[PDB]
Structures are given as structure tokens and as C-alpha cells.
């Protein structure tokens with residue numbers, strides 16, 4: 001399938017799941033697709049209120065307030081060689097690309113890999129300070 005794909009990027013998959021995300025975050029993530037050594041897609045951009053309610057009920061979020069509800073966050077999924085992986089180092093590499101793209105765009109993007117506790121690689125968001133809601 002991918003033997004002749006000299007540089008693997010999941011552009012189309014990502015752009016589809018970026019629909020409805022804040023345009024400034026979209027711009028950063030699109031640039032990060034160019035820079036990342038690790039292919040990735042956006043597995044979740046906009047999240048419904050019902051999904052967030054389900055997460056609160058189940059205990060995977062404390063609050064119904066989520067940056068995903070308003071367009072201010074994405075969860076990425078690492079796709080090395082077209083295969084999903086959850087291994088940390090892939091997400092650290094994606095975050096290098098996001099950090100570069102963000103800097104170039106003059107936008108701070110917070111990464112879940114730098115949460116104070118329970119670090120998790122997929123999550124990126126625009127800050128509440130810069131992008132209130």
C-alpha cells in the first residue's frame with residue numbers, strides 16, 4: 001500500500017477532522033503536518049456536549065467545560081507507516097512539530113504531554129488566556 005509513498009502524511013484525514021476547529025489552531029496543526037517526522041491524524045477536534053457529558057459520567061473528565069466543545073482543541077493520533085500507535089515517543093515528536101508551527105504562527109499551543117500530572121500525548125489546545133471562551 002505505502003511502499004511508494006516517499007513521504008507519508010495524513011493530510012486529507014486530518015483536514016476532515018479539523019472541520020469546525022478554531023481557524024488559528026487549524027493553521028498550526030496544518031503546518032505541523034509538514035514538519036513532523038511522525039505521520040499523524042486528528043482523531044478528535046470538535047466534541048459534542050453529549051460526548052463530554054458521557055466523559056464526565058464515566059470519570060474521564062471532571063468538567064463539562066472542555067476546549068474541544070468550542071473548537072479550541074484537537075487530539076492527534078500517531079500513524080507511523082499508516083498504523084495507529086499510542087507510544088509516547090511518537091507524540092513527543094509530533095509535539096516538536098506543533099511547537100515549531102505554533103511559534104512560527106505566533107500562537108501558544110498547550111500540549112497534554114506537558115500537563116502537570118497525568119501527561120498524555122494526544123491533546124493540544126489554544127490557551128484560555130489567548131483565546132477565551
Ligand SMILES: [Cl-]
Pocket residue numbers: 099103
Ligand atoms: Cl517554543
Ligand SMILES: [Zn+2]
Pocket residue numbers: 068073074075122123124
Ligand atoms: Zn483532548
